[PDB]
Coordinates of N, CA, C and O in Angstrom, one line a residue:
Chain M
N21 N -28.4 -3.0 -8.0 CA -27.5 -4.2 -7.9 C -26.1 -3.8 -8.1 O -25.2 -4.6 -7.9
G22 N -25.8 -2.5 -8.5 CA -24.4 -2.1 -8.7 C -23.5 -1.9 -7.5 O -22.3 -1.8 -7.7
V23 N -24.1 -1.7 -6.4 CA -23.3 -1.4 -5.2 C -22.6 -2.7 -4.7 O -23.2 -3.7 -4.6
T24 N -21.3 -2.5 -4.4 CA -20.5 -3.7 -4.0 C -19.6 -3.1 -2.9 O -18.8 -2.2 -3.1
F25 N -19.6 -3.8 -1.7 CA -18.8 -3.3 -0.6 C -17.9 -4.4 0.0 O -16.8 -4.1 0.4
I26 N -18.3 -5.7 -0.1 CA -17.4 -6.8 0.3 C -16.7 -7.2 -1.0 O -17.2 -7.9 -1.8
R27 N -15.5 -6.7 -1.1 CA -14.7 -6.8 -2.3 C -13.6 -7.9 -2.2 O -12.8 -8.1 -3.2
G28 N -13.6 -8.7 -1.2 CA -12.7 -9.8 -1.0 C -11.3 -9.3 -0.6 O -11.1 -8.1 -0.3
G29 N -10.4 -10.3 -0.4 CA -9.1 -10.0 0.1 C -9.0 -9.7 1.6 O -8.0 -9.3 2.0
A30 N -10.1 -10.0 2.3 CA -10.1 -9.8 3.7 C -9.1 -10.8 4.4 O -8.4 -10.4 5.3
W31 N -9.0 -12.0 3.9 CA -8.1 -13.0 4.4 C -6.8 -12.9 3.5 O -6.8 -13.5 2.4
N32 N -5.8 -12.2 4.0 CA -4.6 -12.0 3.2 C -3.5 -12.8 3.9 O -3.3 -12.8 5.1
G33 N -2.7 -13.6 3.1 CA -1.7 -14.5 3.6 C -0.6 -13.7 4.3 O 0.2 -14.3 5.1
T34 N -0.4 -12.4 4.0 CA 0.7 -11.7 4.6 C 0.5 -11.6 6.1 O 1.5 -11.8 6.8
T35 N -0.7 -11.4 6.6 CA -1.0 -11.3 8.0 C -1.4 -12.6 8.6 O -1.9 -12.6 9.7
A36 N -1.3 -13.7 7.8 CA -1.8 -15.0 8.2 C -3.2 -15.1 8.7 O -3.6 -15.8 9.6
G37 N -4.0 -14.2 8.0 CA -5.5 -14.2 8.3 C -5.9 -13.3 9.4 O -7.1 -13.1 9.6
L38 N -4.9 -12.7 10.2 CA -5.3 -11.8 11.2 C -5.8 -10.5 10.6 O -5.7 -10.2 9.4
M39 N -6.4 -9.7 11.4 CA -7.0 -8.4 11.0 C -8.1 -8.6 9.9 O -8.4 -7.8 9.1
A40 N -8.7 -9.8 9.9 CA -9.8 -10.1 9.0 C -11.0 -9.3 9.4 O -11.7 -8.6 8.6
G41 N -11.4 -9.4 10.7 CA -12.7 -8.8 11.2 C -12.7 -7.3 11.0 O -13.8 -6.7 10.8
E42 N -11.6 -6.6 11.0 CA -11.6 -5.1 10.8 C -12.1 -4.7 9.4 O -12.8 -3.7 9.3
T43 N -11.7 -5.5 8.4 CA -12.2 -5.2 7.1 C -13.7 -5.3 6.9 O -14.4 -4.5 6.3
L44 N -14.3 -6.4 7.5 CA -15.7 -6.6 7.5 C -16.4 -5.5 8.3 O -17.5 -5.0 7.9
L45 N -15.8 -5.0 9.4 CA -16.4 -3.9 10.2 C -16.4 -2.7 9.4 O -17.4 -1.9 9.3
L46 N -15.3 -2.4 8.6 CA -15.3 -1.2 7.8 C -16.3 -1.3 6.7 O -17.0 -0.3 6.4
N47 N -16.4 -2.4 6.1 CA -17.4 -2.6 5.0 C -18.8 -2.4 5.5 O -19.7 -1.8 4.8
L48 N -19.1 -3.0 6.7 CA -20.4 -2.8 7.3 C -20.7 -1.3 7.6 O -21.8 -0.9 7.4
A49 N -19.7 -0.6 8.1 CA -19.9 0.8 8.4 C -20.2 1.6 7.1 O -21.1 2.4 7.1
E50 N -19.5 1.3 6.0 CA -19.8 1.9 4.7 C -21.2 1.6 4.2 O -21.9 2.5 3.7
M51 N -21.6 0.3 4.4 CA -23.0 0.0 4.0 C -24.0 0.7 4.8 O -25.0 1.2 4.2
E52 N -23.8 0.9 6.1 CA -24.7 1.6 6.9 C -24.8 3.1 6.5 O -25.9 3.7 6.5
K53 N -23.6 3.7 6.3 CA -23.6 5.1 5.8 C -24.3 5.3 4.5 O -25.1 6.2 4.4
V54 N -24.1 4.4 3.6 CA -24.8 4.5 2.3 C -26.3 4.3 2.5 O -27.1 5.1 1.9
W55 N -26.7 3.4 3.3 CA -28.2 3.2 3.6 C -28.8 4.5 4.2 O -29.9 4.9 3.9
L56 N -28.0 5.1 5.2 CA -28.6 6.3 5.9 C -28.7 7.4 4.9 O -29.7 8.2 4.9
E57 N -27.7 7.6 4.1 CA -27.7 8.8 3.2 C -28.8 8.8 2.1 O -29.4 9.8 1.9
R58 N -29.0 7.6 1.5 CA -29.9 7.4 0.4 C -31.3 7.0 0.9 O -32.1 6.7 0.0
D59 N -31.5 6.9 2.2 CA -32.8 6.5 2.6 C -33.9 7.6 2.3 O -33.5 8.8 2.2
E60 N -35.1 7.2 2.2 CA -36.2 8.1 1.9 C -37.5 7.6 2.4 O -37.7 6.3 2.4
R61 N -38.4 8.5 2.7 CA -39.8 8.1 3.1 C -40.6 8.1 1.8 O -40.8 9.1 1.2
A62 N -41.2 6.9 1.5 CA -41.8 6.7 0.3 C -43.3 7.1 0.4 O -43.9 7.0 1.4
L63 N -43.8 7.5 -0.8 CA -45.3 7.8 -0.9 C -46.1 6.5 -0.9 O -45.6 5.5 -1.4
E64 N -47.3 6.6 -0.4 CA -48.2 5.5 -0.3 C -49.3 5.7 -1.3 O -49.9 6.8 -1.4
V65 N -49.7 4.6 -2.1 CA -50.9 4.7 -2.9 C -51.6 3.3 -2.8 O -50.9 2.3 -2.8
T66 N -52.9 3.4 -2.6 CA -53.7 2.2 -2.6 C -54.6 2.1 -3.8 O -55.2 3.2 -4.1
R67 N -54.7 1.0 -4.4 CA -55.5 0.8 -5.6 C -56.4 -0.4 -5.5 O -56.1 -1.4 -5.0
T68 N -57.7 -0.2 -5.9 CA -58.7 -1.2 -5.8 C -59.1 -1.6 -7.3 O -59.4 -0.7 -8.1
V69 N -59.0 -2.9 -7.6 CA -59.2 -3.4 -8.9 C -60.4 -4.4 -8.8 O -60.4 -5.3 -8.0
Chain J
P5 N 44.0 15.1 -9.3 CA 43.9 15.4 -7.9 C 42.5 15.5 -7.3 O 42.3 15.1 -6.2
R6 N 41.6 16.1 -8.1 CA 40.2 16.2 -7.7 C 39.6 14.8 -7.5 O 38.9 14.5 -6.5
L7 N 39.9 13.9 -8.4 CA 39.4 12.5 -8.3 C 40.0 11.8 -7.0 O 39.3 11.2 -6.3
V8 N 41.3 12.0 -6.8 CA 41.9 11.4 -5.7 C 41.4 11.9 -4.3 O 41.2 11.2 -3.4
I9 N 41.1 13.2 -4.3 CA 40.6 13.8 -3.1 C 39.2 13.4 -2.8 O 38.8 13.1 -1.7
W10 N 38.4 13.2 -3.9 CA 37.0 12.7 -3.8 C 37.0 11.3 -3.2 O 36.3 11.0 -2.3
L11 N 37.9 10.4 -3.8 CA 38.0 9.1 -3.3 C 38.4 9.0 -1.8 O 37.8 8.3 -1.0
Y12 N 39.4 9.8 -1.4 CA 39.8 9.8 -0.1 C 38.7 10.3 0.9 O 38.5 9.6 1.9
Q13 N 38.0 11.3 0.5 CA 37.0 11.9 1.4 C 35.8 10.9 1.5 O 35.3 10.6 2.6
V14 N 35.4 10.2 0.4 CA 34.3 9.3 0.4 C 34.7 8.1 1.3 O 33.9 7.6 2.1
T15 N 35.9 7.5 1.1 CA 36.3 6.4 1.9 C 36.4 6.7 3.3 O 36.0 5.9 4.2
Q16 N 36.9 7.9 3.7 CA 37.0 8.3 5.1 C 35.6 8.4 5.7 O 35.4 7.9 6.8
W17 N 34.7 9.0 5.0 CA 33.3 9.1 5.5 C 32.7 7.7 5.7 O 32.0 7.4 6.7
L18 N 32.9 6.8 4.7 CA 32.3 5.4 4.8 C 32.9 4.7 6.0 O 32.2 4.0 6.7
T19 N 34.2 4.8 6.2 CA 34.8 4.2 7.4 C 34.3 4.8 8.7 O 34.0 4.0 9.6
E20 N 34.2 6.1 8.8 CA 33.7 6.7 10.0 C 32.2 6.3 10.3 O 31.9 6.0 11.4
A21 N 31.4 6.2 9.2 CA 30.0 6.0 9.4 C 29.6 4.5 9.5 O 28.5 4.1 9.7
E22 N 30.6 3.6 9.4 CA 30.5 2.2 9.5 C 29.5 1.7 8.4 O 28.6 0.9 8.7
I23 N 29.7 2.1 7.2 CA 29.0 1.6 6.0 C 30.0 0.9 5.1 O 31.0 1.5 4.6
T24 N 29.7 -0.3 4.7 CA 30.5 -1.0 3.7 C 30.3 -0.5 2.3 O 29.3 0.2 2.0
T25 N 31.2 -0.8 1.5 CA 31.1 -0.3 0.1 C 29.9 -1.0 -0.6 O 29.3 -0.3 -1.5
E26 N 29.7 -2.2 -0.3 CA 28.5 -2.9 -0.9 C 27.2 -2.2 -0.6 O 26.3 -2.1 -1.4
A27 N 27.1 -1.8 0.7 CA 25.9 -1.1 1.1 C 25.7 0.2 0.4 O 24.6 0.5 -0.1
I28 N 26.7 1.0 0.2 CA 26.6 2.2 -0.5 C 26.3 2.0 -1.9 O 25.5 2.7 -2.6
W29 N 26.8 0.9 -2.5 CA 26.5 0.5 -3.9 C 25.0 0.2 -4.0 O 24.4 0.8 -4.9
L30 N 24.5 -0.6 -3.1 CA 23.1 -0.9 -3.2 C 22.2 0.3 -2.9 O 21.1 0.3 -3.4
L31 N 22.8 1.3 -2.2 CA 22.0 2.5 -1.9 C 21.9 3.4 -3.1 O 20.9 4.0 -3.4
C32 N 23.0 3.5 -3.9 CA 23.1 4.6 -4.9 C 23.2 4.0 -6.3 O 23.4 4.9 -7.2
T33 N 23.1 2.7 -6.5 CA 23.3 2.2 -7.9 C 22.0 2.6 -8.7 O 20.9 2.7 -8.2
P34 N 22.2 2.8 -10.0 CA 21.0 2.9 -10.9 C 20.5 1.6 -11.5 O 19.4 1.6 -12.1
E35 N 21.3 0.5 -11.4 CA 20.9 -0.8 -11.9 C 19.8 -1.5 -11.1 O 19.8 -1.4 -9.9
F36 N 18.9 -2.2 -11.8 CA 17.9 -3.0 -11.1 C 17.7 -4.3 -11.8 O 18.1 -4.5 -12.9
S37 N 17.1 -5.2 -11.1 CA 16.9 -6.6 -11.6 C 16.0 -6.6 -12.8 O 16.3 -7.3 -13.8
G38 N 14.9 -5.8 -12.8 CA 14.0 -5.7 -13.9 C 12.9 -6.8 -13.7 O 12.0 -6.8 -14.7
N39 N 12.8 -7.5 -12.7 CA 11.8 -8.5 -12.5 C 11.0 -8.2 -11.3 O 11.5 -7.6 -10.3
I40 N 9.7 -8.4 -11.3 CA 8.8 -8.1 -10.2 C 9.1 -9.0 -9.0 O 9.2 -10.3 -9.2
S41 N 9.4 -8.5 -7.9 CA 9.7 -9.2 -6.7 C 8.5 -9.6 -5.9 O 7.4 -8.9 -6.0
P42 N 8.6 -10.6 -5.0 CA 7.4 -10.9 -4.2 C 6.9 -9.8 -3.3 O 5.7 -9.7 -3.1
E43 N 7.8 -8.9 -2.8 CA 7.4 -7.8 -2.0 C 6.4 -6.9 -2.8 O 5.4 -6.4 -2.3
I44 N 6.8 -6.6 -4.1 CA 6.0 -5.7 -4.9 C 4.6 -6.4 -5.2 O 3.6 -5.8 -5.3
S45 N 4.7 -7.8 -5.4 CA 3.5 -8.5 -5.6 C 2.5 -8.4 -4.4 O 1.3 -8.2 -4.6
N46 N 3.1 -8.6 -3.2 CA 2.3 -8.4 -2.0 C 1.7 -7.0 -1.9 O 0.5 -6.8 -1.5
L47 N 2.5 -6.0 -2.2 CA 2.0 -4.6 -2.1 C 0.9 -4.4 -3.1 O -0.2 -3.8 -2.7
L48 N 1.0 -4.9 -4.3 CA -0.1 -4.7 -5.3 C -1.4 -5.5 -4.8 O -2.5 -5.0 -5.0
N49 N -1.2 -6.7 -4.3 CA -2.4 -7.5 -3.9 C -3.1 -6.8 -2.8 O -4.3 -6.8 -2.7
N50 N -2.3 -6.3 -1.8 CA -3.0 -5.7 -0.7 C -3.5 -4.3 -1.0 O -4.3 -3.7 -0.3
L51 N -3.0 -3.7 -2.1 CA -3.4 -2.3 -2.4 C -4.6 -2.3 -3.4 O -5.3 -1.3 -3.3
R52 N -4.8 -3.3 -4.2 CA -5.9 -3.2 -5.2 C -7.2 -3.1 -4.5 O -8.0 -2.2 -5.0
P53 N -7.6 -3.9 -3.5 CA -9.0 -3.7 -2.9 C -9.2 -2.3 -2.3 O -10.4 -1.8 -2.4

């Protein structure tokens, strides 16, 4: 739960809201890179009760 | 005489370079307002994220 990538401030009044989409694109790229690097193939166990 | 030659040289340079005395004062003064300006506030707001 500690990972945070959308930190706000995308809509900044200085640019009148322009260049908003670029920040979300960068955040999504960072999220994809984090997912790729820390991905892992998990072990399988089946239990009968 | 050193002071007078310094004044003459500086004034001649300012006249040649088309720089008013107020502009050079604002360029080289050590005094400042001491209050945070809106530009600095915008810089901080855009820089924090």
